[PDB]
Design a protein around this ligand. Structure first.
Ligand SMILES: *[C@@H]1O[C@H](CO)[C@@H](O)[C@H](O)[C@H]1NC(C)=O
Ligand SMILES: *[C@@H]1O[C@H](CO)[C@@H](O)[C@H](O)[C@H]1NC(C)=O
Ligand SMILES: *[C@@H]1O[C@H](CO)[C@@H](O)[C@H](O)[C@H]1NC(C)=O
Lengths: 428, 410, 443
């Protein structure tokens, strides 16, 4: 009855409770929502008049030219190239090209042979196809290039070449037009006849003739085993690109790493998912095998054919399957990638067939089995942008709670005085 | 007193803004969230593949040619070989003897059996198979009848067996098969008919296991004499039901007579099947159900006309809405020459075929993930009910807050 | 109940007394403190919401809407060889010899002996100018006469299984010369529609690229390429073909499947974006309808006329066709200038409404052994010729489904006012009591 006696104090009392109820709910909802850290994406295109041409890494599918494999190399690495068994003579199986095998007989004869020093990197450098031999003609945006414009990079395919690498303090090339002309355009000889011969199915061996190619930002090392595409001989292969600029959101909204002036990677200048994974592979091999593979950076010693077989390969195989967690290599926030439409036509035309052959002193046959043209260019001089945009920033959370907090405080202040007014009366 | 002027003015404003936010709610606006999320495993997809040649020439018996001669377009409706200006005299000669019905008593015939017997055999075609470096064989392929005939789905997820997973991406770490398309068993063509094409190779569909193959429409071509790399990206799509969108609410029951799991493909096959049974009292070899297989006559005289009627001229019979939850695959095709000169002589010896044969018949198919990374594409509601109610909380904050202020006067 | 006696200790009643003398100033001081605090909040959030409005934020809405019909696109296709060797007359060789690079600027066949003795012998005869009186010459006429004839190239044509002929292909001059757009939508004729997608149910053509009519090549020049095949652009009918830049290559000896997806884009004008608001007024000298392609051709044309008092064969306008001389000495250099050294001259922004096409290229061999013998006899050619010259092109829709890609306004005016309204209306409700004490005291 002291409560009942309220005489419409009690309605005031409950209505303030009703309002404090409402305020808690709305403020909960808007704060629960803030914390899902919702985002949505903004697609756009914006025309440029210049575009920075990408890096173009390209590898022959054949790792080692047959000719350049010395008796010494065969002695150290014979088992690794699977040209020899574990007993360093020529495997039993008889499927082999008797003329080509004859040359391996001679090389693999070790009677009274004194071993010389051997180094995997040197072997790859010497034996790997030479851009100078492969590259029959080169034109960037109609201008002549030669082998001088190709920087050597060791990959898991061996001696490869990045064009417009942006390395060695030379400037990154730019296209001012789209279309078939205004790009890189190269004629390669894949030198099919220097291919390591295959007479037995092995874990190692393949039937491919051609090249793999990666188009990539200069701020990114080539990871061509995984990300590259195939170009076959006997076709001009057009590769129309679209530049794509991605902006992703860090945690808590997303997962990206903020690229800055400090790379945060032992062995590289710029953070990229590729750079990160190579850094990781390299660190881990050094740590667990006290050596690195030819294509890894650092001062460490190159693995010997035995450490390749008995330490490195097993360890890397472990790293991926049974030690996944060891290396989180998350995406950067700022990033540039390239769309690609492959299309092709036959090379050479009948009209041009007889000429090419004469000009390089090769059979017409050879041109059809060995010669390709690669036409990398921009379809359009414009880049697509793909931004993740925060759906609800703090400015908004406060905006929405803010006005309600300001008038609930105002009302609760009024209730403090009616509780002192009630107290005063009771007190007396 | 004066608060009449203010409180009405304010309640005016608040009722307006409250209707704006309700009109907005009812436009049921959405926008999309693209994301990439790195996984360490990925479920490898289903890979259905068909020879472009439906029936091996060898396996086509005199009896088959008698019943289905007009269907294979090897014969006209008079059981005669159409007058050819000039065919391959060698190939023609073998049709002469097959199509000779002197003394011939017709034996029993069944389209399904014909397809099963005559269709290319995976066991003949599949020279070499490797998943993730491991050996596979014909046991890892499941037969599916499609509108191209006897085809094979790899990693089907059917027959109990578990769905395979890639733990790394690249050229190696997926399916890698060497096929012989058996060019020499191709039905011969001496004249132009509706059926006549000039294609040699295979069609391939990469698809979710939760989805039957629709390879006539969705498959892509792979040529012989090339290793064709097919770098995929897994894409997980989430679409919004009505009123925001038109996707079909994903539930436990298929809502299709003949299929376990709802797919745009499953739905269209179900539809085609129901309609043909209803209108033609039979089904085609590749359709499910207990119905009787159509005879070559019903194929020609009932089924083909009915299907062709259904699509253009009877659109409305078949509403096959998209699932909300689903999985698709991006593809980059690229290719290199097969075999290399170095490897040419070996392949030939190893399969007892000419080097010639290898160049016209042998292909390699390399399906894999470019990166172990799935892209997500969600339609996300722009204004949920939780929010509209949140904002009319604005109205209750004045309503309660105004009445409390009125209690001070009285 | 001692608490009732003396009515609470003196200490307390005295407190209660201070309260009551002070109350009227607490009430005022608190409302001053609170009303200011609230008006502070209101001014801030109302600023924030207006700053945000003016960044004119947008975000994008992807959807896939099914349909039962789709308008089939335009398909422009060009032979990669610009001029058939046969149709090159003595007169043409005289005027344009240098342009086709069959002659140097000295009216001789470059000293080179690298060439086919048989094919060279026919150039000797043509390029003999002894006693020769030149006739009149016109680049457009030369292209029209010498360009490959669709009627010769097109061995078989089927739209959705129905037969088509050369009559169904409209001629367009491009920078590759005499080319052909199928389902152009020009000349009144209606735009074709597929009612179902898949390998059959679209355009399916067999071409002979006529390899043996290719201009012969013995010496490296800018024009010299070794390509044999065709380039193809799939494009909306509302858009001229820009096939040098946007086309893709199709090789002979393969059936090339080209599975398309229709894509409808809606982009936002300024201030949100940069697109050109659709008007039926083209605002383009030479075209009916705005496209980025139409705009760039218009520009190229205006600029060349302006700088070179002539146009190239493929450009519109009434201007005179450039002579082989003006092509070499004026036009090519000027266009090259326009792009590199005069970038800013030519502002060709994207339209807001438009339609694009996704493409998956895939291929199989042609012809099958079974069909090899037939094709050869049916066209009176070696089996050799079929493998080097014959291609099939299969353009179709993968599914009857268009994808929509809309930029949508993130914060429209309805919202800005709604929110500034809600805050202004919420502050009024709270500060009601302070309004009266501001008028009471004022009184
Ligand atoms: C980094 O991203 C921001 C995004 O606003 C941009 O201003 C800048 O040019 C980018 N720079 C890079 C990739 O280093
Ligand atoms: C789709 O199905 C999967 C099966 O595990 C489920 O986890 C998922 O929540 C569904 N996707 C969405 C976002 O509804
Ligand atoms: C063009 O105008 C508007 C939107 O910009 C819309 O109705 C539709 O997307 C377009 N309509 C056409 C091309 O008929």
């Amino acid at each position: 009855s002291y409560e009942r006696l309220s005489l419409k104090r009690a309605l005031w009392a409950l209505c303030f409770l009703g309002s404090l109820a409402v305020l808690l709910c709305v403020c909960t909802e808007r704060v629960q929502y803030y914390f899902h850290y919702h985002h949505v994406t903004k697609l756009d295109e914006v025309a440029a008049s210049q575009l920075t041409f990408p890096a173009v890494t390209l590898c022959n599918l054949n790792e080692f030219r047959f000719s350049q494999v010395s008796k010494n190399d065969l002695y150290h690495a014979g088992e690794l190239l699977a040209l020899l068994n574990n007993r360093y003579e020529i495997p039993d199986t008889q499927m082999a090209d008797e003329k080509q095998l004859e040359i391996l007989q001679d090389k693999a004869n070790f009677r009274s042979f004194k071993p010389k020093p051997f180094n995997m990197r040197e072997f790859y450098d010497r034996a790997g196809h030479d851009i100078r031999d492969m590259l029959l003609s080169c034109h960037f945006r109609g201008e002549v290039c030669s082998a001088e414009d190709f920087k050597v990079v060791f990959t898991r395919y061996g001696k490869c070449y990045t064009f417009n690498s942006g390395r060695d303090g030379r400037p990154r090339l730019k296209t001012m037009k789209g279309g078939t002309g205004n790009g890189l355009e190269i004629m390669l000889d894949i030198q099919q006849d220097e291919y390591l011969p295959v007479w037995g199915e092995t874990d190692e061996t393949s039937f491919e003739a051609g090249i793999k190619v990666q188009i990539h930002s200069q701020d990114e090392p080539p990871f061509i085993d995984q990300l590259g595409f195939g170009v076959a001989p006997g076709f001009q292969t057009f590769v129309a690109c679209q530049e794509q600029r991605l902006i992703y959101l860090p945690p808590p909204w997303g997962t990206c790493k903020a690229v800055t002036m400090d790379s945060d990677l032992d062995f590289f200048d710029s953070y990229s998912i590729t750079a990160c994974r190579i850094d990781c592979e390299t660190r881990y091999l050094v740590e667990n095998c006290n050596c690195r593979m030819v294509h890894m950076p650092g001062d460490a010693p190159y693995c010997t054919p035995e450490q390749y077989k008995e330490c490195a390969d097993p360890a890397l195989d472990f790293l991926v399957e049974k030690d996944q967690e060891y290396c989180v290599c998350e995406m950067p926030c700022n990033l540039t990638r390239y769309g690609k439409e492959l299309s092709m036509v036959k090379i050479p035309s009948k009209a041009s067939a007889k000429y090419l052959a004469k000009k390089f002193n090769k059979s017409e046959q050879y041109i059809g089995e060995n010669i390709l043209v690669l036409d990398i260019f921009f379809e359009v001089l414009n880049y697509e942008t793909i931004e993740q945009k925060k759906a609800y920033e703090i400015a908004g959370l406060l905006g929405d709670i803010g006005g309600q907090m300001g008038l609930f405080i105002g009302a609760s202040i009024l209730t403090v005085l009616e509780l002192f007014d009630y107290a005063y009366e009771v007190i007396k």
